[PDB]
């Protein structure tokens, strides 16, 4: 099975640069059947590039493919802000076709520190039985966020999930949200509730924190 | 034209089967190649197989050979995809892509490559059952600009949608990716930023839909007196 592997994973460029993007496969693609997709969040996949190098009508011409045998490359001259998603590299000359796990290209800015959040769970909540501790980290650059959660100064391990949203269109930045899921006889089995988070933004790992019941 | 368009998502449970549909609007339905391929949540794309109705010829991807059957309707221009044995493993969004071509008919050649795609089928494989969710506020701390927002814990299954004040709130907004928690239920976190002076003034309501539960619940979101 032939193993395409794109380089990099994650790319960040500013709105005008050019972006180049790396394909390998394990051993040789026949007939230079190279492929490549444009894949905006949401949406369905696109075809940019065929034969490798062959630009379909309607596609930009700031698009190019090139690389022939084992290592290709797809090139973007001037990076409009609509370029600005996941890209994949695809073979199609052999009975069974494969992809490549795919390249973000995601935009570059000036670092932005996160407006940290938290926020007690709600006596409704508690009255059920479970008990919701929220992490906000609000509006930051690049992606790259460490969340920690310390009750009564003590790590925590397997019992928070955390989701981020995608780069922001406007302003290109991330936000992200923990949880911290306990139960009502643990919850109120302690005292202070903190979240640590550590970012490029921040010198100082910035810490928030409450108290129960207070 | 040349305007392929799938089914409604599914939400089936495991060892049952799933049928994916995908109508092909104008053009020429029997000449190329519609292949399927999927997309796991987070994850890339990887091509199960492909069909061409003309020759009647079929050819499956491994990993799914014999636990996968695709056919071909040229009566209704419509190719079909079945999934059995299904597993929470197969919970994804399905897409059916035709190939390309240069030219139309004896003139050019298909390009192989996969040029026309489906809006995709997202297809959830779980044995939990549909639930409306739960509704918490996140209260904007008593403690320039603050933060409050509502969580939507405990429903399944996807989506949940969140709009706050009837829609008259849009920038600031932030409706987190949902988690499936162990218990096997989703829940999001949707939040958005307001300028502190507004808050024991303005009432803000975050309006959480969830259609496949068919439930409607809007909750105000008020600071926490104490």
């Known amino acids: 099975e032939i193993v395409l592997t794109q380089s990099p994973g994650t790319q960040s460029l500013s709105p005008g640069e050019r972006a180049t993007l790396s394909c390998r496969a394990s051993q040789s693609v026949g007939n230079n059947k190279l492929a490549w997709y444009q894949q905006r969040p949401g949406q369905a996949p696109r075809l940019l590039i065929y034969?490798?190098?062959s630009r379909p009508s309607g596609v930009a011409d700031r698009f190019s493919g090139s690389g022939s045998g084992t290592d290709f490359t797809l090139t973007i001259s001037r990076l409009e802000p609509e370029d600005f998603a996941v890209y994949y590299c695809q073979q199609y000359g052999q009975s069974l076709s494969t992809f490549g796990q795919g390249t973000k290209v995601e935009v570059k800015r000036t670092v932005a520190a996160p407006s940290v959040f938290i926020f007690p769970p709600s006596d409704e909540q508690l009255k059920s039985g479970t008990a919701s501790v929220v992490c906000l980290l609000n509006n930051f650059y690049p992606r790259e966020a460490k969340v920690q959660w310390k009750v009564d100064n003590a790590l925590q391990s397997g019992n928070s999930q955390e989701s981020v949203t995608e780069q922001d269109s406007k302003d290109s930045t991330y936000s992200l949200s923990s949880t911290l899921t306990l139960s009502k006889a643990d919850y109120e089995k302690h005292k202070v509730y903190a979240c640590e988070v550590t970012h490029q933004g921040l010198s100082s790992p910035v810490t928030k924190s409450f108290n129960r019941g207070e | 034209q040349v305007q392929l368009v799938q089914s409604g998502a599914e939400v089936k449970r495991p060892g049952s089967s799933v049928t994916v549909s995908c109508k092909a609007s104008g053009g020429s339905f029997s000449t190329y190649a519609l292949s399927w391929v999927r997309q796991a949540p987070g994850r890339g794309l990887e091509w199960m197989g492909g069909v061409i109705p003309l020759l009647t010829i079929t050819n499956y991807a491994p990993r799914f050979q014999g636990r996968i059957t695709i056919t071909a309707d040229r009566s209704t221009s419509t190719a079909y995809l079945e999934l059995n044995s299904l597993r929470p493993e197969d919970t994804a969004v399905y897409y059916c892509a035709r190939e390309g071509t240069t030219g139309w008919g004896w003139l050019g050649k298909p390009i192989g490559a996969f040029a026309h795609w489906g809006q995709g089928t997202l297809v959830t494989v779980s044995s939990a059952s549909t639930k409306g969710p739960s509704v918490f506020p996140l209260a904007p701390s008593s403690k320039g600009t603050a933060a409050l927002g509502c969580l939507v814990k405990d429903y399944f299954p996807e989506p949940v949608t969140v709009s706050w004040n009837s829609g008259a709130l849009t920038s600031g907004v932030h409706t987190f990716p949902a988690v499936l928690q162990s218990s096997g239920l989703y829940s999001l976190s949707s939040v958005v930023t307001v300028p502190s002076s507004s808050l024991g003034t303005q009432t803000y309501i975050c309006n959480v839909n969830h259609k496949p539960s068919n439930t409607k619940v809007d909750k105000k979101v008020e600071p926490k007196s104490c």
């Open positions: 034969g490798a190098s």
